[PDB]
Design a protein around this motif. Structure first.
Motif, short mmCIF file in Angstrom:
data_model
loop_
_atom_site.label_atom_id
_atom_site.label_comp_id
_atom_site.label_asym_id
_atom_site.label_seq_id
_atom_site.Cartn_x
_atom_site.Cartn_y
_atom_site.Cartn_z
N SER A 98 0.85 -1.18 0.00
CA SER A 98 0.00 0.00 0.00
C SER A 98 0.89 1.24 0.00
CB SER A 98 -0.95 0.04 1.20
OG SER A 98 -1.84 1.14 1.12
N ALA A 99 0.25 2.39 -0.18
CA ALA A 99 0.88 3.71 -0.07
C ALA A 99 2.10 3.82 -0.99
CB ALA A 99 1.25 4.01 1.38
N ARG A 100 1.83 3.73 -2.29
CA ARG A 100 2.90 3.83 -3.29
C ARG A 100 3.18 5.29 -3.58
NH1 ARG A 100 2.95 2.33 -9.72
NH2 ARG A 100 5.23 2.16 -9.95
N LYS A 101 4.35 5.77 -3.14
CA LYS A 101 4.83 7.11 -3.45
C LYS A 101 6.07 6.96 -4.32
CE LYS A 101 3.41 8.25 1.26
NZ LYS A 101 2.12 7.70 0.75
N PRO A 102 5.92 6.82 -5.64
CA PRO A 102 7.08 6.51 -6.49
C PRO A 102 8.11 7.63 -6.56
CG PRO A 102 4.99 6.02 -7.59
CD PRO A 102 4.67 6.85 -6.40
N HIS A 103 7.80 8.83 -6.07
CA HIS A 103 8.75 9.94 -6.10
C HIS A 103 9.76 9.81 -4.96
CE1 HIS A 103 4.78 11.28 -4.39
NE2 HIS A 103 5.55 11.41 -3.32
N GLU A 104 10.43 8.66 -4.94
CA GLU A 104 11.51 8.37 -4.00
C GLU A 104 11.04 8.50 -2.55
OE1 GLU A 104 14.20 6.58 -4.66
OE2 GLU A 104 12.95 6.70 -6.46
N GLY A 113 9.78 5.52 0.08
CA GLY A 113 9.54 4.10 0.20
C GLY A 113 10.08 3.32 -0.98
N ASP A 114 11.39 3.39 -1.19
CA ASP A 114 12.03 2.77 -2.33
C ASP A 114 12.57 1.38 -1.95
OD1 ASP A 114 12.34 3.18 -5.05
OD2 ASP A 114 14.44 3.79 -4.85
N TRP A 115 13.30 0.76 -2.87
CA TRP A 115 13.89 -0.57 -2.74
C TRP A 115 12.84 -1.67 -2.71
CZ3 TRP A 115 19.14 -1.95 -2.20
CH2 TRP A 115 20.02 -0.87 -2.17
N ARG A 116 11.57 -1.30 -2.64
CA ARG A 116 10.49 -2.27 -2.74
C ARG A 116 9.78 -2.16 -4.08
NH1 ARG A 116 7.17 -0.40 1.17
NH2 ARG A 116 5.68 -1.84 0.19
N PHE A 117 10.29 -1.33 -4.97
CA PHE A 117 9.79 -1.22 -6.33
C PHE A 117 10.87 -1.31 -7.38
CE2 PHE A 117 7.05 1.52 -3.63
CZ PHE A 117 5.92 0.74 -3.67
N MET A 118 12.13 -1.09 -7.02
CA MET A 118 13.21 -1.11 -8.00
C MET A 118 13.44 -2.53 -8.49
SD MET A 118 17.13 0.11 -7.65
CE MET A 118 17.03 0.08 -5.87
N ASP A 119 13.51 -2.70 -9.81
CA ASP A 119 13.79 -4.00 -10.39
C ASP A 119 15.23 -4.37 -10.11
OD1 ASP A 119 14.70 -6.06 -12.26
OD2 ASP A 119 12.86 -5.73 -13.39
N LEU A 120 15.46 -5.10 -9.02
CA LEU A 120 16.80 -5.49 -8.61
C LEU A 120 17.18 -6.87 -9.13
CD1 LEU A 120 18.21 -3.32 -7.00
CD2 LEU A 120 18.32 -4.91 -5.09
N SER A 121 16.63 -7.29 -10.26
CA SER A 121 16.99 -8.58 -10.83
C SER A 121 18.44 -8.56 -11.29
CB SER A 121 16.06 -8.92 -11.99
OG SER A 121 14.95 -9.69 -11.55
N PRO A 122 19.08 -9.73 -11.38
CA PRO A 122 20.51 -9.77 -11.75
C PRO A 122 20.82 -9.14 -13.11
CG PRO A 122 19.83 -11.86 -10.81
CD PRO A 122 18.58 -11.05 -10.98
N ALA A 123 19.82 -8.85 -13.93
CA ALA A 123 20.05 -8.19 -15.21
C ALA A 123 19.46 -6.78 -15.18
CB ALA A 123 19.46 -8.99 -16.35
#
Ligand code: ZN
Ligand code: ZN
Lengths: 222, 276
Positions: free
Chosen positions: B258-264, B266-276
């Motif tokens: 909940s509470a998605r504030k994409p303007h930095e 609550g980060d690191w829970r949306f960044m695509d941190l896949s190995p590629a």
């Protein structure tokens, strides 16, 4: 025959740089001097900011061998990481001593399973805090055949799907008291005048951290 | 898509019943006002609960909550790969196993699983229902069951309504074809929800989510008459009644996404941190 519980977040490594000499290079050492990662990168901060360079996270893990409800509802270990029945024991005992260096940022780690949280909290204080948050989580989730859940489900089944979606929130204020209760308790432990606050350790709501670990953001240990 | 098929199958018999039939049952004595009212009520329940199940939160867990190290482009260490066995209470005689999902980078709680379509780790995973177009997790299982039950009940009530109508018309079936159409459509959409509901009752009678059942099927490929009971259920409670009660009526619990504030914020829970 029972397998012993241990802090299953920590992992070890042998190629590292000892402390005391500025010219330390990565070499292989005896297991008794094997590096053990204990504090982790701060997930609760934006990259490149200041607190990301100032703070490290220490996780109190999830346990399963304490209560009959530890499988359905989350319950966290009430021990300081480093005192588990299957944790590595060093010569310093129960305190945290810098032993070697590892991953980027030149972070210092000790060659035992003890955690830098030991520099701030004590066993009794940690037990008290964790027990309170355990109780709050349990009474928040509630029992299966309890009136909260059964009334919710019955009126939901009656009105199709709408009472929990749109119609319910409009009508009743004080049924959401446990969420704000846990929030107030954690915010009070964090706020000035609190046990965690005075010592320099901040706690995060188990609602934010997915309720799959109890995290303590501590200053990046040196 | 495939959810539009079920939405059309849900909204069609209302129109066909409110254009042609829901006028010769009010004041004709070819039917009962109680039956008309019950049919409309159960149909509203079914449509509302299908919309709810299709737009509800299966109980997804946040991502990257358990990172390890920022080196080698966020490489996962060795000790995280193998399984970890942890002890349960003194009563339950069986230990439990725990695994590290390398996509979301969290230590999966017991009974959670990964959906290869939505790419999230649901809390008590049942299966990825294609029709509803959602994962049937822990926080909307009750809604899925309410949908199946409402479908069964609406079909039965429409069936008895059309039957009492066709049985009481004097001019013969040569003056009400739409009643026969509705009867056939009800008799056809009464089967599959009943089959799914009975399958789910027999599953939840041994504390087994559909994923667990199809996993434990092993080398036998008979998904119908497998012995639904096992002897190594850690989550067993004692009887069919209590197992059903603890699996179907499970408390929803708080919502973790909940509470998605994409303007930095609550980060690191949306960044695509896949190995590629
Ligand atoms: Zn995952
Ligand atoms: Zn899915």
């Amino acid at each position: 025959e029972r397998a012993l519980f241990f802090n299953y977040h920590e992992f070890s490594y042998s190629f590292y740089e000892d402390l005391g000499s500025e010219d330390a290079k990565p070499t292989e050492h005896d297991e008794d001097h094997k590096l053990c990662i204990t504090h982790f990168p701060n997930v609760y901060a934006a990259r490149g900011s200041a607190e990301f360079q100032v703070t490290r996270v220490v996780r109190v893990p999830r346990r399963f061998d304490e209560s009959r409800s530890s499988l359905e509802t989350p319950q966290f270990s009430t021990q300081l990481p480093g005192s588990e029945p299957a944790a590595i024991v060093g010569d310093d005992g129960t305190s945290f001593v810098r032993c070697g260096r590892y991953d980027i940022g030149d972070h210092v780690f000790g060659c035992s399973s003890v955690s830098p949280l030991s520099e701030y909290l004590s066993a009794a204080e940690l037990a008290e805090v964790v027990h309170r948050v355990n109780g709050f989580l349990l009474r928040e989730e509630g029992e299966v055949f309890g009136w909260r859940n059964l009334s919710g489900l019955l009126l939901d089944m009656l009105t199709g799907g709408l009472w929990s979606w749109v119609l319910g929130p409009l009508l009743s204020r004080p049924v959401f008291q446990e969420s704000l209760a846990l929030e107030q308790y954690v915010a009070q432990l964090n706020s000035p005048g609190g046990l965690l606050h005075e010592r320099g350790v901040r706690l995060v709501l188990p609602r934010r951290s997915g309720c799959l670990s109890l995290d303590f953001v501590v200053p990046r240990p040196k | 898509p495939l959810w539009l098929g079920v939405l059309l199958a849900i909204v069609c018999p209302m129109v066909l019943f409110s254009i042609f039939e829901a006028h010769k049952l009010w004041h004709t004595q070819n039917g009962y006002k109680v039956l008309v009212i019950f049919f409309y009520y159960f149909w509203v329940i079914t449509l509302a609960s299908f919309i709810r199940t299709a737009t509800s939160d299966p109980g997804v867990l946040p991502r990257n909550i358990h990172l390890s190290q920022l080196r080698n482009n966020y490489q996962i260490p060795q000790e995280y790969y193998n399984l970890i066995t942890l002890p349960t209470h003194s009563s339950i005689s069986k230990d439990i196993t725990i695994k590290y999902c390398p996509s979301c980078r969290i230590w999966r709680p017991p009974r959670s699983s990964h959906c290869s379509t939505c790419n999230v780790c649901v809390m008590v995973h049942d299966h990825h229902c294609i029709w509803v177009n959602n994962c049937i997790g822990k926080r909307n299982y009750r809604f899925f069951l309410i949908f199946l039950l409402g479908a069964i009940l609406s079909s039965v009530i429409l069936l008895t309504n059309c039957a009492i109508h066709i049985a009481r018309e004097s001019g013969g079936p040569r003056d009400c074809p739409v009643a026969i159409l509705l009867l056939c459509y009800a008799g056809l959409t009464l089967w599959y929800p009943a089959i799914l509901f009975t399958y789910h009752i027999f599953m939840a009678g041994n504390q087994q989510t559909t994923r667990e059942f199809l996993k434990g099927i092993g080398s036998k490929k008979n998904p119908v008459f497998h012995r639904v009971v096992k002897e190594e259920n850690i989550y067993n409670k004692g009887s069919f009644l209590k197992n059903m009660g603890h699996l179907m009526l499970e408390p929803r619990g708080p919502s973790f996404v909940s509470a998605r504030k994409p303007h930095e914020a609550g980060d690191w829970r949306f960044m695509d941190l896949s190995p590629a």
